[PDB]
Nucleic acid binder design. Structure first.
Ligand SMILES: [Zn+2]
Length: 376
RNA sequence: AGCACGGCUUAAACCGUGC
């Protein structure tokens, strides 16, 4: 019933576990949100995604805009209906495509005009349009339109991009409030930029706080500066942001990264790793990452992870999946990904449990320990 | 093709190293 209602229920240091209440469902936090870029979480049926424990999936604007197209999905009944996921969905503004598809992109002030990475055509993605697109889709959590600042970057672009991104953060807000159908049902998040310079991360925070958002996300990180630098930034960045609103670290997601970011104060995560690595052949277990393609697993009858409760681990051997993935079989990508996502969820679960038991810091250290041991 | 590995923080059921 409530549009957006963040409510922290426990804390331990800069970390905290809570719940986000939206019209489409409840979101347990800290939470990990699987990435279903083009209206699908690679190799997984919506129900399976839910089966693993995800309360919310993330969809991308840039891609959806091009295919199957904003207006078309809308004409079909909204993304949710289109793909078969009735729980909340968070759509990215496409600010990531501005820095990864930068190749075929031309920046300005009105927005970012780029060429279809497959079609070749031309599209002008503006703060206005991005928010319109996200409205058409029917996304529950709308992300402002930003520009993920590449790394490394001189204090020049570091500020240009940032400042321009804020100007855009305002245009989004306005756009988001222009339609009451969207302002009454969805939520809006703002993205903090400024690379690794704090005096800049400060400005961005303030600019964002002035405008007013339902949730604040730290972006521009995990863009290749190593865990070290990132944590170093999160150390002063997350604190600049409004404490009574959720904090969302975009793109980050690697067991140890997530665990650390939580200690730093993050509430939400979204990342390609689990779903991409599944497809490729890498599985995430309590004993570190393992590449199921290795010769060793050829006759290994144990499951990907003996602690995992996932449906895969309850029924298939390493050797079976070894065989499949290695042979190009699709069932492999299905089992791998289902495992990895279920895993990230179980991880998010355990973190939450610990935070509301005041034993998270203990959890974290026990985690890295066994995680880096790799006695699997 | 294949074998032994490695990376991935959606232009990746993909790429890269060695034989
Ligand atoms: Zn599993």
């Amino acid at each position: 019933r409530p549009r957006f209602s963040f409510s922290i229920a426990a804390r331990e240091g800069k970390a905290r576990t809570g719940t986000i209440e939206m019209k489409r469902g409840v979101i347990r936090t800290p939470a990990f949100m699987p990435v279903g870029t083009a209206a699908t979480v690679k190799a997984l049926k919506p129900e399976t995604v839910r089966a693993t424990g995800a309360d919310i999936i993330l969809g991308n604007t840039y891609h959806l805009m091009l295919r199957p197209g904003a207006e078309r999905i809308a004409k079909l009944g909204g993304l949710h209906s289109f793909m078969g996921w009735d729980r909340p969905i968070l759509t990215d503004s496409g600010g990531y495509q501005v820095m990864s598809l930068s190749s075929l992109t031309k920046q300005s002030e009105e927005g970012v005009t780029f060429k279809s990475h497959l079609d070749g055509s031309r599209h002008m993605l503006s703060p206005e349009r991005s928010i319109e697109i996200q409205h058409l889709l029917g996304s529950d959590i709308v992300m402002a339109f930003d520009e993920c600042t590449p790394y490394p970057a001189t204090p020049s672009r570091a500020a240009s991009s940032m400042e321009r991104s804020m100007r855009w953060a305002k245009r989004s807000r306005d756009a988001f409030d222009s339609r009451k159908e969207q302002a009454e049902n969805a939520a809006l998040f703002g993205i903090q930029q400024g690379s690794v310079f704090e005096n800049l991360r400060q400005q961005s925070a303030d600019a964002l706080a002035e405008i007013g958002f339902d949730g604040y996300a730290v972006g521009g990180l995990a863009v290749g500066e190593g865990q070290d630098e990132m944590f170093r930034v999160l150390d002063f960045s997350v604190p600049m942001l409004p404490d009574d609103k959720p904090h969302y670290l975009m793109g980050v997601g690697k067991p140890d990264d997530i665990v650390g970011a939580v200690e730093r104060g993050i509430d939400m995560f979204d990342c390609v790793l689990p779903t991409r690595s599944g497809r490729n052949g890498q599985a995430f277990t309590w004993d570190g990452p393992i590449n199921i393609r290795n010769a060793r697993f050829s006759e290994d009858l144990k499951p990907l992870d003996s602690e995992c409760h996932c449906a895969v681990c309850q029924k298939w051997s390493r050797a079976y999946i070894h065989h499949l993935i290695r042979a190009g079989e699709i069932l492999g990508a299905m089992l791998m990904t289902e495992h990895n996502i279920a895993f990230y969820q179980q991880l998010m679960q355990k973190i939450r449990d610990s935070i509301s038991e005041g034993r998270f810091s203990q959890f974290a250290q026990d985690f890295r320990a066994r995680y880096f041991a790799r006695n699997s």
